[PDB]
Amino acid sequence: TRTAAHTHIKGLGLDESGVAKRVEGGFVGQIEAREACGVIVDLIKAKKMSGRAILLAGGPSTGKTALALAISQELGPKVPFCPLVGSELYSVEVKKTETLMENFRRAIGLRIKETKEVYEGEVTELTPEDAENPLGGYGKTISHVIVGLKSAKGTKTLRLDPTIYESIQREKVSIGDVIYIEANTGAVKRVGRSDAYATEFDLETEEYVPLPKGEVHKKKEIVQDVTLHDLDVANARPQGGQDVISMMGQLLKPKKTEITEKLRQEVNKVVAKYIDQGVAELIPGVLFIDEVNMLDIEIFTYLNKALESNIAPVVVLASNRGMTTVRGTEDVISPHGVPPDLIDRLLIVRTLPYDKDEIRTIIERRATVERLQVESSALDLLATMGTETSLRYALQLLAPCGILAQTSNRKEIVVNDVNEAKLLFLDAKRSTKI
Amino acid sequence: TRTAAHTHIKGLGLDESGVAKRVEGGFVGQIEAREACGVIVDLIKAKKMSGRAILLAGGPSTGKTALALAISQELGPKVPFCPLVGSELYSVEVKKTETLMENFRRAIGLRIKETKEVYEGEVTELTPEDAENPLGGYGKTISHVIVGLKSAKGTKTLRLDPTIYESIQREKVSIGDVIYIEANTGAVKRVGRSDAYATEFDLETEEYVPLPKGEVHKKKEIVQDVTLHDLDVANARPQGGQDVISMMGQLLKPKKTEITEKLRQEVNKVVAKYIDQGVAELIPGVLFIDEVNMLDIEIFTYLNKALESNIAPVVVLASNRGMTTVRGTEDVISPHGVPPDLIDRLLIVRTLPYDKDEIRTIIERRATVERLQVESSALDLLATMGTETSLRYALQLLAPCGILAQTSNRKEIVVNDVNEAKLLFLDAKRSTKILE
Amino acid sequence: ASDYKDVERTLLKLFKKNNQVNRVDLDFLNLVFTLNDKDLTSYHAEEISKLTCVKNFVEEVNKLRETNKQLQEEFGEASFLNFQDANQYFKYSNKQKLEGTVDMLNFLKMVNKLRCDRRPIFGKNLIDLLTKDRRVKYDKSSII
Amino acid sequence: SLSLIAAHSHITGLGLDENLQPRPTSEGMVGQLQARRAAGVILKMVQNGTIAGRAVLVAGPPSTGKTALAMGVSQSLGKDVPFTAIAGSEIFSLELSKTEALTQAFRKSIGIKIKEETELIEGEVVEIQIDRSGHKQGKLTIKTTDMETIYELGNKMIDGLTKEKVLAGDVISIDKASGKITKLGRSFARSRDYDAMGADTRFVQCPEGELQKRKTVVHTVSLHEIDVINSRTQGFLALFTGDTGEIRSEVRDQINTKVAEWKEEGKAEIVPGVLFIDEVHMLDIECFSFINRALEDEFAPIVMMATNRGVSKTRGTNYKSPHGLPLDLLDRSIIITTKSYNEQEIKTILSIRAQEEEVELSSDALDLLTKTGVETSLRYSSNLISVAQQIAMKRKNNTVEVEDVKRAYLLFLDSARSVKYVQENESQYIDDQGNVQISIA
Amino acid sequence: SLSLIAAHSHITGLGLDENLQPRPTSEGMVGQLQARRAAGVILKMVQNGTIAGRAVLVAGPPSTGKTALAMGVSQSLGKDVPFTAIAGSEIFSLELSKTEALTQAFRKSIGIKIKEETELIEGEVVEIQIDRSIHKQGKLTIKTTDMETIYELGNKMIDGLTKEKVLAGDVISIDKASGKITKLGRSVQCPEGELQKRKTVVHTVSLHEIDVINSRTQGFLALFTGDTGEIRSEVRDQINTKVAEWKEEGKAEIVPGVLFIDEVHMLDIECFSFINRALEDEFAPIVMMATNRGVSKTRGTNYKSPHGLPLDLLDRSIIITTKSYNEQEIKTILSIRAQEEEVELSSDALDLLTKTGVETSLRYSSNLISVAQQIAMKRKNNTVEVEDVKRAYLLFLDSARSVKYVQENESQYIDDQGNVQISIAK
Numbered sequence A: 001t002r003t004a005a006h007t008h009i010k011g012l013g014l015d016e017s018g019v020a021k022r023v024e025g026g027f028v029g030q031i032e033a034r035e036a037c038g039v040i041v042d043l044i045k046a047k048k049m050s051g052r053a054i055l056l057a058g059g060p061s062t063g064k065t066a067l068a069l070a071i072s073q074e075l076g077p078k079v080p081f082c083p084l085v086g087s088e089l090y091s092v093e094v095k096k097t098e099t100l101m102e103n104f105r106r107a108i109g110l111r112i113k114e115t116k117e118v119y120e121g122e123v124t125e126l127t128p129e130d131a132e133n134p135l136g137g138y139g140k141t142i143s144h145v146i147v148g149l150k151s152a153k154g155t156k157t158l159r160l161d162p163t164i165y166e167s168i169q170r171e172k173v174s175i176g177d178v179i180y181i182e183a184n185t186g187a188v189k190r191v192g193r194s195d196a197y198a199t200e201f202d203l204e205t206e207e208y209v210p211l212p213k214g215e216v217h218k219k220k221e222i223v224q225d226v227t228l229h230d231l232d233v234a235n236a237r238p239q240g241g242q243d244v245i246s247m248m249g250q251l252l253k254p255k256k257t258e259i260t261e262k263l264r265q266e267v268n269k270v271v272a273k274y275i276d277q278g279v280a281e282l283i284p285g286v287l288f289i290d291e292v293n294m295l296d297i298e299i300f301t302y303l304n305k306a307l308e309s310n311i312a313p314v315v316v317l318a319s320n321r322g323m324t325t326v327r328g329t330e331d332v333i334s335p336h337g338v339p340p341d342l343i344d345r346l347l348i349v350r351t352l353p354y355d356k357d358e359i360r361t362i363i364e365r366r367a368t369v370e371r372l373q374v375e376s377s378a379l380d381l382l383a384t385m386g387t388e389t390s391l392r393y394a395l396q397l398l399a400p401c402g403i404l405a406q407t408s409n410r411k412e413i414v415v416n417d418v419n420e421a422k423l424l425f426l427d428a429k430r431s432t433k434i
Numbered sequence B: 001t002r003t004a005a006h007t008h009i010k011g012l013g014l015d016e017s018g019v020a021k022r023v024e025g026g027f028v029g030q031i032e033a034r035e036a037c038g039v040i041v042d043l044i045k046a047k048k049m050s051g052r053a054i055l056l057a058g059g060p061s062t063g064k065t066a067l068a069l070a071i072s073q074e075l076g077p078k079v080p081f082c083p084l085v086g087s088e089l090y091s092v093e094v095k096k097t098e099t100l101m102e103n104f105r106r107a108i109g110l111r112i113k114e115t116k117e118v119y120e121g122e123v124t125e126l127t128p129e130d131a132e133n134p135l136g137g138y139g140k141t142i143s144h145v146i147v148g149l150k151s152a153k154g155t156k157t158l159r160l161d162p163t164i165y166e167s168i169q170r171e172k173v174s175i176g177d178v179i180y181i182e183a184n185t186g187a188v189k190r191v192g193r194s195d196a197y198a199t200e201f202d203l204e205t206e207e208y209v210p211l212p213k214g215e216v217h218k219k220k221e222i223v224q225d226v227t228l229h230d231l232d233v234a235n236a237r238p239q240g241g242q243d244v245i246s247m248m249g250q251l252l253k254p255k256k257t258e259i260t261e262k263l264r265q266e267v268n269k270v271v272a273k274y275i276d277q278g279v280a281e282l283i284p285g286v287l288f289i290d291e292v293n294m295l296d297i298e299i300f301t302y303l304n305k306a307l308e309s310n311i312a313p314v315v316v317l318a319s320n321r322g323m324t325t326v327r328g329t330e331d332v333i334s335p336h337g338v339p340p341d342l343i344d345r346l347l348i349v350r351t352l353p354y355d356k357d358e359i360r361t362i363i364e365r366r367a368t369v370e371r372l373q374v375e376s377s378a379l380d381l382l383a384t385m386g387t388e389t390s391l392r393y394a395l396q397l398l399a400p401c402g403i404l405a406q407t408s409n410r411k412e413i414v415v416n417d418v419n420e421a422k423l424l425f426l427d428a429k430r431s432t433k434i435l436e
Numbered sequence C: 001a002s003d004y005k006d007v008e009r010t011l012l013k014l015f016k017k018n019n020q021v022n023r024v025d026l027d028f029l030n031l032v033f034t035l036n037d038k039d040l041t042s043y044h045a046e047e048i049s050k051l052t053c054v055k056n057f058v059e060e061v062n063k064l065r066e067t068n069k070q071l072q073e074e075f076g077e078a079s080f081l082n083f084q085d086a087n088q089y090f091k092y093s094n095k096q097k098l099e100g101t102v103d104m105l106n107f108l109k110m111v112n113k114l115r116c117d118r119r120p121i122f123g124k125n126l127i128d129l130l131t132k133d134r135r136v137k138y139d140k141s142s143i144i
Numbered sequence D: 001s002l003s004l005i006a007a008h009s010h011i012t013g014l015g016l017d018e019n020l021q022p023r024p025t026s027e028g029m030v031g032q033l034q035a036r037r038a039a040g041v042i043l044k045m046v047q048n049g050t051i052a053g054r055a056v057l058v059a060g061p062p063s064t065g066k067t068a069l070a071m072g073v074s075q076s077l078g079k080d081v082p083f084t085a086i087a088g089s090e091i092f093s094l095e096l097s098k099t100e101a102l103t104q105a106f107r108k109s110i111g112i113k114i115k116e117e118t119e120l121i122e123g124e125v126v127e128i129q130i131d132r133s134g135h136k137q138g139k140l141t142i143k144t145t146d147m148e149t150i151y152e153l154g155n156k157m158i159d160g161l162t163k164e165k166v167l168a169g170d171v172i173s174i175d176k177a178s179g180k181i182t183k184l185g186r187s188f189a190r191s192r193d194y195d196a197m198g199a200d201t202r203f204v205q206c207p208e209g210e211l212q213k214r215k216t217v218v219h220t221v222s223l224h225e226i227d228v229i230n231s232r233t234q235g236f237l238a239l240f241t242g243d244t245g246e247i248r249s250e251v252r253d254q255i256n257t258k259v260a261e262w263k264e265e266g267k268a269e270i271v272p273g274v275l276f277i278d279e280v281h282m283l284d285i286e287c288f289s290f291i292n293r294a295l296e297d298e299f300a301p302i303v304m305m306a307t308n309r310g311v312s313k314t315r316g317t318n319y320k321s322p323h324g325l326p327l328d329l330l331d332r333s334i335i336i337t338t339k340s341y342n343e344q345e346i347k348t349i350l351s352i353r354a355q356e357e358e359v360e361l362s363s364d365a366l367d368l369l370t371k372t373g374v375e376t377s378l379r380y381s382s383n384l385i386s387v388a389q390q391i392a393m394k395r396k397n398n399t400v401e402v403e404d405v406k407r408a409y410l411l412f413l414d415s416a417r418s419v420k421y422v423q424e425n426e427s428q429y430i431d432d433q434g435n436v437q438i439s440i441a
Numbered sequence E: 001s002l003s004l005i006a007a008h009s010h011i012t013g014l015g016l017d018e019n020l021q022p023r024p025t026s027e028g029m030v031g032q033l034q035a036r037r038a039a040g041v042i043l044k045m046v047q048n049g050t051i052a053g054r055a056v057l058v059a060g061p062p063s064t065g066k067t068a069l070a071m072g073v074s075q076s077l078g079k080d081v082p083f084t085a086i087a088g089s090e091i092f093s094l095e096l097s098k099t100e101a102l103t104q105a106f107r108k109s110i111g112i113k114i115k116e117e118t119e120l121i122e123g124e125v126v127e128i129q130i131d132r133s134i135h136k137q138g139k140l141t142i143k144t145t146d147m148e149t150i151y152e153l154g155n156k157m158i159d160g161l162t163k164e165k166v167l168a169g170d171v172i173s174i175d176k177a178s179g180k181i182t183k184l185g186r187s188v189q190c191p192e193g194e195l196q197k198r199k200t201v202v203h204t205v206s207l208h209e210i211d212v213i214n215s216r217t218q219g220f221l222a223l224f225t226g227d228t229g230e231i232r233s234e235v236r237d238q239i240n241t242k243v244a245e246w247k248e249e250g251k252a253e254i255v256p257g258v259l260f261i262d263e264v265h266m267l268d269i270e271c272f273s274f275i276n277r278a279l280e281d282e283f284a285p286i287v288m289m290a291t292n293r294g295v296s297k298t299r300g301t302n303y304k305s306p307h308g309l310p311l312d313l314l315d316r317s318i319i320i321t322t323k324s325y326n327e328q329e330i331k332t333i334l335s336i337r338a339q340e341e342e343v344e345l346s347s348d349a350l351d352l353l354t355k356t357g358v359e360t361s362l363r364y365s366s367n368l369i370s371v372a373q374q375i376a377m378k379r380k381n382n383t384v385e386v387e388d389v390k391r392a393y394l395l396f397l398d399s400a401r402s403v404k405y406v407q408e409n410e411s412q413y414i415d416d417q418g419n420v421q422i423s424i425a426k
């Protein structure tokens, strides 16, 4: 129901073993940029390279942010995408380099696939079977503990090992309780009483949970997604409890800190171990730094060093500048805002300006997205203004025209509404004249 | 008593009709400025308007601070008046905007009254009682406690909740100790030991205190004047709690924090409710910012927004420079060093320089208030010196003249004493000449 | 700093005498409300505010006051003169006792009104609801 | 709300008709018909709630109704729709980065209406009977004004009752989901039993109606509040202290996902609001570059911006800009302009201000004030009104007249006369070079 | 107070007579007749205490005696009166605003004397008898020079004595009110009279100390740790009003003092703007400011000023000007320095030192005395002769000769442009 500025960008709209369609996925025009973004997306999906930089170079209202969002949508929500504005790097709690590194490691992702066998159901029988003692001594010995669990369309009896008695005592389970016992670990966990005994007492503090469905023996595959930043922060943070370190952590507000290279290397080592064990897979991801012109020279030098890291994501930068001095420098005039050292390490994609027909098609598709109806003459006038002042000016002017039409009890936008909005809301040029 | 620079200023010195006398209230001259300040004082006493601002514009040594302090004296000690200078806003713990806002709410006083009932006296009995049946309660099953307090006018036997008994035990109260119970909150305080048992032991560490006067059960109405900023600070950094975390936080330094607008809104809600109920009354004060030139353009821009609030005191500003570039800006030459947008929200009260007669009268009054006797000839010499260099130079040269006269065992300052003071202590122009 | 403890004790003792006398308990008047979010709930606070017992206090005060009016009608011209009769002194003592209990009820009513008005800005139920870890349980938690 | 008569205290809202046609004077606003139409269109855009992240710039000469228009928009929006009004200089902090301050401002402008369902039993316990050896068993009685029922208590319920130390005459509430017991207070019958009462004790009536009740309650919480609560373990204190720090980006992403899940499940509703930045020209180029991308979000609010500078220098850059703002931000912003008032509009504004300040002006005094306003400034006459009222009251006259306004004009100067006096006596006031002649003779 | 020899150790006072006329050489000060007369006027104003918020500027050329004058004023002012001496570079802190630092400096120089009357028993302990509950029964005996009596203890006194574990035969001190126990060695010393004495103890504190004490739960540690923080202004107002009330009651007296800023030419315009108003209010001490630069640009401003200070502050100050010394005064100052440093100079050695000081600098000749003494000691000679001073001159260079050497060999040093010729060849 909400309508941001890129709700209609569903993807790049390419075809397999082909090129960009003229209009598909909410994109009109920009064939070369869409094809380049497609090959970059293929490279990212290959998941075999690190520190690959592409720069989205073009003027305002040329589709750069739309292209970045299309890359994000094409890769899917599983690949970690980290939108960012260059202004965000300038923190007050830590240095710029630390923030850049944190974003870098936030772009890398990890997927953990674990299969677990579990028996679940209401406890019905609890009987230990006596057996002969190997050491004699006239003592009473147990060789197994028998637990009977009943489920929806299922029930079974288990001859578990004698060790279960400790977990049963610790979890203070009873007959009528529904429990959760791991097949290979031997631990147990009770989630509550069965709903069948909710009537036995009028009041009871414990929560009665519905009887679990299916067979008692269930095999489940749990997938969890984490980022290297998440692991680093979790390892750099106290557990949280009654110990004294957590108490002083409660007293002193947790500020960002320079996470040392030792902790990061430990995280990398454990991740590599579990990846080799076959439980985890690595996803590179994308780090999108919009308005790269805002970055200072120190951040650019650290990008130069960090792009060479053996584990780094694909960095997409966007700049609407021409020959401008690099921030933090007095006489370094470089193409776009990026200093020449970083430009040598990246690949540039151009975003062309639009024609009248492209502007008109964009306007009509946006109007369709906003659930608005426009007359042909009104659409032609809107496109004329878009080519006269700005595309974004008309795209934004769509909504006030709709409001004016609705106030006039009309379900369609007409040239009168367009002119009324034009007089009410001035553009940058007409206001500068005023 | 100590004699500061503005001790002689006792008031604006106006008539009932608003006209300003030539010499009254320690002031000499400045008729128009004094009348304008009197109208402003009436406006403050009206207590109807918020965000009104005036700016005292004039040259150095003209009386801007004198007029501000006269306004403060005329309003009285029951109305807030927070002095400031432009440099004090630049803190290192919080943004300058937060400091300005805290100063704004430090000048909106609130008078809140609360009726409190206290039981005080010397403990004579303490007889805890259990329930009539053991099954009545849990564990100890402690019922009410009976305490007997003694005062100068008699004794009273009180029936207390078991919570008060627990408090009594916590405070370690025995028979004979003078105690203090607040029925408003249930708090028990141990004043000390009665003077009656002072000589029970010849060596004992006990703060012996006399028996309380009046009745044991005295009801008193307590009235306090608190600013809104006091409530904001109380909410931001509450002193409650006896946990380890609470005490550790108490030991920490009280760094200023950006108190959110939500807390201010909630404080305003509760204060409005109490004002409606009649419990509290609002006293808009005055905020005085001397040397407004030192504020940055950001501070002025935030002042534009602050002055439009529903609760804002009467800010009085002083500037002693004209056609000066505003701090934090490269090109904006402004009338008084104050941005034009803020000037449009201001009323400028121009203060004018003095002539020889006014300077002479000022020196006379300053010598009188300093407990110094000055000869007419030396006083004319001082007046000529002051009109030659500055009024403040003479006003500060008065004291060394008195010391020099005393060193010669003279009751009054003679012209020779003033000449010797000139020789010993120079002025700015003469120091510049001698260093050149 | 050990040598400075005596100075600290002297200064604190000097300041406490003025501090204690003319202060208003801001906690009692609900002017401080930042601790209430920790131990109070929104609906419980509003229910207690709705369930206040001011009416019972007012009706009991009026009942005692009309009983006192009847007693004054029976007694006649009340006076505080030195007592020479058991009846007169007993009736005067009853009058003063009834006035005292009326005052006690009034003060208790005001205290109860101020105590039941306490409310939290965010109830602990709201904090728990906004902090709850969605629908995640240990059933699908990753052991790794 | 606790308030005094302020600059914008007379604006109840935009004086718009049903067709968004402004009235010549209504709800405390005069003139600015085109600007008021545009403001009403923006207001309806906000009310519809579908369009997200729109930048509006309010431009015009000083003292022309920009902040007045913003106040009117806020009043028309009313409560239940957030409206965060901040200054340009407020975002500069020693604790938060500029981007973090802008993010918190943006999140404050979006409110979440969350529903929580609670089932409770409330009543005054009449009798409690507990038997204990093995596990304990007991029966309990709770009454209302029109109901009474005896319940049987489990072992854990008995343990909770004992740890709460509940006695007869207590009004308690139990959540049947968790069994937690909260003591509301004591009955009135137990008030006489003591002379002094503890801090915990409270006297409450017996609840009415059915013993077991189902109720849903709606809470209005901003996105920023959810982020602060879910950041630390005691963030709700930072919601008041302001010591929140730079909240983690992952926390904000988690909160966005959680709000989306709630909205899909229908227990949370989004009420977008208006972020108003006063004097946007005090912002930096970094802030504007952040704002450009911030508006391109599904949760982004509608941003109103008020500026008066023309071709001025953007802060943080070495070049001039059409409004003091970079061209990229102006591209994605629709501009609402204001126009200087004529004599009649100034007269009506002064009359409205006089009515708000309960000052009874005369016709000749009103004409003199209007002439001073058109000659010098509107705010100058508006401020002179109250000073003239005080002068007239000092003259033991209940109505203001020409003499009072003349005296107020003489006592209190304006910008022009102050500039004239400072220029005529340049030698006695400190200059840029610092030279000043304190001496007179 | 054991310490080594400084550069101002010889100045034990301002050297004035009853009529405030300074003697040619007294209390370690030589010359500067008018400066010392004015300093005596300032000292009398400080001692009177009836004048507040006066600023005196001590201006003049370097090596003329500004810091020496301040030290003489401080010594003649004596103890029992605050004297805070801070350099202008100490204001700039990362934890305190410059205005807050200046405020704390201002409050540090106003002292408050509080008298506390305590009842304490002092004597030589003899016997202690403590018994179990029959809560506790206890008797202690204290012997003095003329009395020997037993005291019947109570519960808390018994607990305190057990906590201290006082032995027998050792001098002990017990306070009746506070209950503090101060141990002393066995009776060199002995009890001197009555068992229970009535002696008052006076505590000297400053307004800043009271502010910091009330700032936190245990704020008095911050007076040593330095983590005071910007104190709330309401707390300072409370301290001020309570000090006024105490002075009215007569239970505490105020001792105004002197604040000395040695290098005011480093403070910025904000600091001066703050000082202008801080001087006006009551409880403002007397501020002494020392500057040397003739006309310079005030820090934080782009314009020159008559002393590096804004004209507003100079209007509020009276200026004491110091004049350069001549040959005889240099000779006697060097003689005083040599006497302080325990160096026996010869007549010709002293004359050579005087001519060197007149030609180059007084400080340079002052520093050469100790080096000359060490040179002579290497020759196993007691008195410092001319040749020792000549060798000291040859081994150690002054500013002018060093500048001449640098100018004549500008290639081998690093210049402002960052160029140097390290290579000895070419």
Ligand SMILES: Nc1ncnc2c1ncn2[C@@H]1O[C@H](COP(=O)(O)OP(=O)(O)OP(O)(O)=S)[C@@H](O)[C@H]1O
Binding pocket: A005, A006, A009, A026, A027, A028, A029, A030, A059, A060, A061, A062, A063, A064, A065, A066, A067, A318, A319, A320, A362, A391, A392, A395, D328
């Ligand atoms: N090829 C395109 N097809 C459809 N819509 C487009 C296309 N290019 C841009 N748009 C839309 O035009 C609007 C502005 O374009 P954006 O790409 O968001 O801005 P931009 O071109 O990156 O310029 P900057 O750098 O942000 S100032 C957005 O609503 C886009 O969705």
Ligand SMILES: Nc1ncnc2c1ncn2[C@@H]1O[C@H](COP(=O)(O)OP(=O)(O)O)[C@@H](O)[C@H]1O
Binding pocket: B005, B006, B026, B027, B028, B029, B030, B059, B060, B061, B062, B063, B064, B065, B066, B067, B320, B362, B391, B392, E280
């Ligand atoms: N009208 C007046 N009557 C008497 N004394 C005055 C008057 N105006 C100023 N003074 C004295 O002159 C001195 C300078 O006043 P002040 O207001 O501090 O200077 P400025 O006006 O530059 O701020 C003060 O000590 C004050 O006592």
Ligand SMILES: Nc1ncnc2c1ncn2[C@@H]1O[C@H](COP(=O)(O)OP(=O)(O)O)[C@@H](O)[C@H]1O
Binding pocket: D007, D008, D009, D028, D029, D030, D031, D032, D061, D062, D063, D064, D065, D066, D067, D068, D069, D349, D378, D379
């Ligand atoms: N159209 C209007 N109707 C009513 N009052 C107005 C109107 N325009 C301006 N005002 C009043 O004029 C005063 C100036 O405010 P404003 O115009 O917002 O200043 P600025 O635009 O310079 O920020 C305000 O108090 C406002 O109430």
Ligand SMILES: Nc1ncnc2c1ncn2[C@@H]1O[C@H](COP(=O)(O)OP(=O)(O)O)[C@@H](O)[C@H]1O
Binding pocket: E007, E008, E009, E011, E028, E029, E030, E031, E032, E061, E062, E063, E064, E065, E066, E067, E068, E069, E333, E362, E363
């Ligand atoms: N009048 C004096 N009497 C005695 N010694 C002096 C005198 N003036 C200066 N000195 C000595 O000269 C040395 C340097 O003086 P100093 O205080 O640094 O002056 P300044 O600060 O103006 O340079 C000090 O060690 C001091 O002992």
Ligand SMILES: [Mg+2]
Binding pocket: A064, A065, A290, A318, D293
């Ligand atoms: Mg973009």
Ligand SMILES: [Mg+2]
Binding pocket: B064, B065, B066, B290
């Ligand atoms: Mg002044």
Ligand SMILES: [Mg+2]
Binding pocket: D066, D067, D278, D306
């Ligand atoms: Mg405005």
Ligand SMILES: [Mg+2]
Binding pocket: E066, E067, E262, E290
């Ligand atoms: Mg020096």
